Enzyme design. Structure first.
Site, PDB file in Angstrom:
ATOM      1  N   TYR A  15       0.686  -1.227  -0.071  1.00 32.94           N
ATOM      2  CA  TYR A  15       0.156  -0.091   0.116  1.00 32.94           C
ATOM      3  C   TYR A  15       0.972   1.284   0.177  1.00 32.94           C
ATOM      4  O   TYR A  15       1.862   1.425   0.951  1.00 32.94           O
ATOM      5  CB  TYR A  15      -1.049   0.162   1.168  1.00 32.94           C
ATOM      6  N   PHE A  16       0.687   2.175  -0.825  1.00 30.20           N
ATOM      7  CA  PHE A  16       1.394   3.172  -1.288  1.00 30.20           C
ATOM      8  C   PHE A  16       0.520   4.589  -0.650  1.00 30.20           C
ATOM      9  O   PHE A  16      -0.385   4.538  -1.225  1.00 30.20           O
ATOM     10  CB  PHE A  16       1.998   3.784  -2.416  1.00 30.20           C
ATOM     11  N   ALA A  17       0.737   5.141   0.347  1.00 27.84           N
ATOM     12  CA  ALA A  17       0.160   6.280   1.089  1.00 27.84           C
ATOM     13  C   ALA A  17       0.873   7.325   0.954  1.00 27.84           C
ATOM     14  O   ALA A  17       2.055   7.416   1.085  1.00 27.84           O
ATOM     15  CB  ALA A  17      -0.283   5.856   2.396  1.00 27.84           C
ATOM     16  N   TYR A  18       0.537   8.727   0.691  1.00 31.77           N
ATOM     17  CA  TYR A  18       0.974  10.078   0.388  1.00 31.77           C
ATOM     18  C   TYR A  18       0.260  10.980   1.459  1.00 31.77           C
ATOM     19  O   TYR A  18       0.714  12.218   1.405  1.00 31.77           O
ATOM     20  CB  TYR A  18       1.029  10.536  -0.966  1.00 31.77           C
ATOM     21  N   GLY A  19      -0.632  10.642   2.359  1.00 32.24           N
ATOM     22  CA  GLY A  19      -1.291  11.359   3.100  1.00 32.24           C
ATOM     23  C   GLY A  19      -1.329  11.208   4.797  1.00 32.24           C
ATOM     24  O   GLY A  19      -0.151  10.837   5.399  1.00 32.24           O
ATOM     25  N   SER A  20      -2.337  11.319   5.243  1.00 36.00           N
ATOM     26  CA  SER A  20      -2.363  10.915   6.888  1.00 36.00           C
ATOM     27  C   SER A  20      -1.731   9.569   7.085  1.00 36.00           C
ATOM     28  O   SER A  20      -1.060   9.357   8.176  1.00 36.00           O
ATOM     29  CB  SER A  20      -3.741  10.869   7.336  1.00 36.00           C
ATOM     30  N   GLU A  62     -10.811   3.907   3.256  1.00 39.28           N
ATOM     31  CA  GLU A  62     -10.597   4.885   2.460  1.00 39.28           C
ATOM     32  C   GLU A  62     -11.926   5.385   1.831  1.00 39.28           C
ATOM     33  O   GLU A  62     -11.706   5.927   0.582  1.00 39.28           O
ATOM     34  CB  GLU A  62      -9.648   4.530   1.411  1.00 39.28           C
ATOM     35  N   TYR A 104      -4.733  18.112  10.021  1.00 41.57           N
ATOM     36  CA  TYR A 104      -4.371  17.127   9.076  1.00 41.57           C
ATOM     37  C   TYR A 104      -3.163  17.394   8.493  1.00 41.57           C
ATOM     38  O   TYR A 104      -2.448  16.504   8.203  1.00 41.57           O
ATOM     39  CB  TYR A 104      -5.536  17.422   8.014  1.00 41.57           C
TER      40      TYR A 104
END
EC number: 4.3.2.9
Length: 169
Positions: free
Chosen positions: A6-11, A85, A126
């Site tokens: 899983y590639f995440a760029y936020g929280s 999500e 945030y």
């Protein structure tokens, strides 16, 4: 093979955050997503009552780039992450992305982005979450500069208790 990336760029840049719901997630690596630009907004015009500000999303933009973290998770978390999500309500749609560590090694990941939204700045809370994540997992110092330069909105009202303490420390 039994687990997914899983590639995440936020929280979910912040380990403590992604661990709330996904306490078994394992840091895999930091990576860059080229030709994608970051942004924040209100899904279907709705304002998140959890964050009280725009939520993170990305779109294809030549030249731009997004840095995040690849987290290794068990495939049994698939549906959990999707529902996490907001895929069912049209909030986010599932996407496949091809990113690469700073060593030039490409990796295929699962991520998320909204398809129907209106730009809106993030709440100061945030923003702190992501910044705490970018710093922690060591995203490129320069990329962090772009995150730290983000103009937040004017929210200072009560916020998620379990998120308050994360920010306090």
């Amino acid at each position: 093979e039994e687990s997914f990336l899983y590639f995440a760029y936020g929280s979910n840049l912040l380990t403590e955050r992604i661990h709330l719901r996904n306490p078994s997630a394992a840091f895999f690596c930091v990576a860059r997503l080229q030709d994608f630009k970051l942004d924040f907004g209100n899904s279907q015009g709705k304002t998140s009552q959890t964050w009280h500000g725009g939520i993170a999303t990305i779109f294809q933009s030549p030249g731009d780039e997004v840095w995040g973290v690849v987290w290794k998770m068990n495939k049994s978390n698939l549906n959990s992450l999707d529902e996490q999500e907001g895929v069912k309500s049209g909030m986010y749609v599932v996407i496949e992305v091809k990113v690469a560590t700073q060593e030039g090694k490409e990796i295929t990941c699962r991520s998320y982005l909204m398809t129907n939204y209106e730009s809106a700045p993030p709440s100061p809370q945030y923003k702190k979450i992501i910044c705490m994540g970018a710093k922690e997992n060591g995203l490129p110092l320069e990329y962090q500069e772009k995150l730290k330069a983000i103009e937040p909105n004017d929210y200072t009202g009560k916020v998620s208790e379990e998120i308050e303490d994360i920010i306090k420390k």
